[PDB]
């Protein structure tokens, strides 16, 4: 039921790299509108499964979400057409601009993401792979959340298994590592790690630990340290995302309220 975009209306212009579904390109729709085009590599996605639920994903509409514009399913490979973000992913943006950010801008980035996630939460829609690498930055510095829900359609045991080399262990709460129990609260945990990515200016969480060591140690209570640029109030917010027990973690509505309160204080 999604918008079936006419592939004749797409002009491919540049390569944007490769991800879990293969090649992604920058292009235009009807000669005018910038778009990103995922060309879904054969065998990389549960395609019929994705097509069944693409309209739900398209119905997610929020300024801080990288919008799914539509799909092209009448040939092989299929295409997913989304909003284009000229400054690329947030992790590289943090690392490339590390020495220019003021602390107010770090908090604003967190707010952008929190707004998107509060919206997803209100629609009972799980991201499942929230991390700085899956946030993108537009030409005016606005951060938006991308690739929400797509984890569910990946065909790659290294990504889908919690002991696979590609699974997002460092963004996962204990109940995901142990029971594959995804919920709004596993997105909350990941958001806390994302806040840490932002305030550390793009450091790798649990650097020097392997994935299995990270899993072992977070299950025993290890938590990420306070980045130098995070105030105590900011750290309290990200740390609240990491309660061992999922039902003790806040909602995104509460987190957004906490972030706004810090802004008001400053
Ligand atoms: C200068 C510049 C601008 C720019 N802009 C964009 C790049 C990409 C993009 C490119 C390559 C990618 F590999 C991915 N991620 C994925 O494909 C997947 C992630 C996940 C998948 S698939 C399934 C499981 C969950 C996570 C991208 F999102 N997208 N969008 C919307 C852009 O606007 N890039 N650069 C270099
Ligand atoms: C009016 C015009 C464009 C848009 P979106 C769009 C979605 C799918 C296909 C084509 C366009 C848009 C896309 C790129 C840049 C700015 C807006 C929304 C209202």
From Swiss-Prot:
User: What is the associated disease?
Assistant: X-linked agammaglobulinemia: Humoral immunodeficiency disease which results in developmental defects in the maturation pathway of B-cells. Affected boys have normal levels of pre-B-cells in their bone marrow but virtually no circulating mature B-lymphocytes. This results in a lack of immunoglobulins of all classes and leads to recurrent bacterial infections like otitis, conjunctivitis, dermatitis, sinusitis in the first few years of life, or even some patients present overwhelming sepsis or meningitis, resulting in death in a few hours.
Q: What is the effect of changing residue 159 to F?
A: Loss of phosphorylation of GTF2I
Task: Give residues where Phosphotyrosine occurs.
Answer: 159, 225
Job of this protein: Non-receptor tyrosine kinase indispensable for B lymphocyte development, differentiation and signaling. Binding of antigen to the B-cell antigen receptor (BCR) triggers signaling that ultimately leads to B-cell activation. After BCR engagement and activation at the plasma membrane, phosphorylates PLCG2 at several sites, igniting the downstream signaling pathway through calcium mobilization, followed by activation of the protein kinase C (PKC) family members. PLCG2 phosphorylation is performed in close cooperation with the adapter protein B-cell linker protein BLNK.
The Protein kinase domain extends over: 10-263
Q: Which residues bind clofedanol?
A: 82-85, 150
On subunit structure and binding partners, the annotation says:
Part of a complex composed of EEIG1, TNFRSF11A/RANK, PLCG2, GAB2, TEC and BTK; complex formation increases in the presence of TNFSF11/RANKL. Binds GTF2I through the PH domain. Interacts with SH3BP5 via the SH3 domain. Interacts with IBTK via its PH domain. Interacts with ARID3A, CAV1, FASLG, PIN1, TLR8 and TLR9. Interacts with MPL/TPOR.
Q: What is the effect of changing residue 129 to H?
A: In XLA; severe
Name of the protein: Tyrosine-protein kinase BTK
What's the reported outcome of changing residue 38 to R?
Answer: In XLA; complete loss of kinase activity
Modification after translation (UniProt): Following B-cell receptor (BCR) engagement, translocates to the plasma membrane where it gets phosphorylated at Tyr-159 by LYN and SYK.
């Amino acid at each position: 039921g999604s918008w079936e975009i006419d592939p004749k209306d797409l002009t491919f212009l540049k390569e944007l790299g490769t991800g879990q579904f293969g090649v992604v390109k920058y292009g235009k729709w009807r000669g005018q509108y910038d778009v990103a085009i995922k060309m879904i590599k054969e065998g990389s996605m549960s395609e019929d499964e994705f097509i069944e639920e693409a309209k739900v994903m398209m119905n997610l509409s929020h300024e801080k979400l990288v919008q799914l514009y539509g799909v092209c399913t009448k040939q092989r490979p299929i295409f997913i057409i989304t909003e284009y973000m000229a400054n690329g992913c947030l992790l590289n943006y943090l690392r490339e601009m590390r020495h220019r950010f003021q602390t107010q801008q770090l908090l604003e980035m967190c707010k952008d993401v929190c707004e998107a996630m509060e919206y997803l939460e209100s629609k009972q829609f799980l991201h499942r792979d929230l991390a700085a690498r899956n946030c993108l930055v537009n030409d005016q510095g606005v951060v938006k959340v991308s690739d929400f829900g797509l984890s569910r359609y990946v065909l790659d045991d290294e990504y889908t298994s919690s002991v696979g080399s590609k699974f997002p262990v460092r963004w996962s709460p204990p109940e995901v590592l142990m029971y594959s129990k995804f919920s709004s609260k596993s997105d909350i945990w990941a958001f806390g790690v994302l806040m840490w990515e932002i305030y550390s200016l793009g450091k790798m969480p649990y650097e020097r630990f392997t994935n299995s060591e990270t899993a072992e140690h977070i299950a025993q209570g290890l938590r990420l340290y306070r980045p130098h640029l995070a105030s105590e109030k900011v750290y309290t917010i990200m740390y609240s995302c990491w309660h061992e027990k999922a039902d003790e973690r806040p909602t995104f509505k509460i987190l957004l309220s906490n972030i706004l309160d810090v802004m008001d204080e400053n």
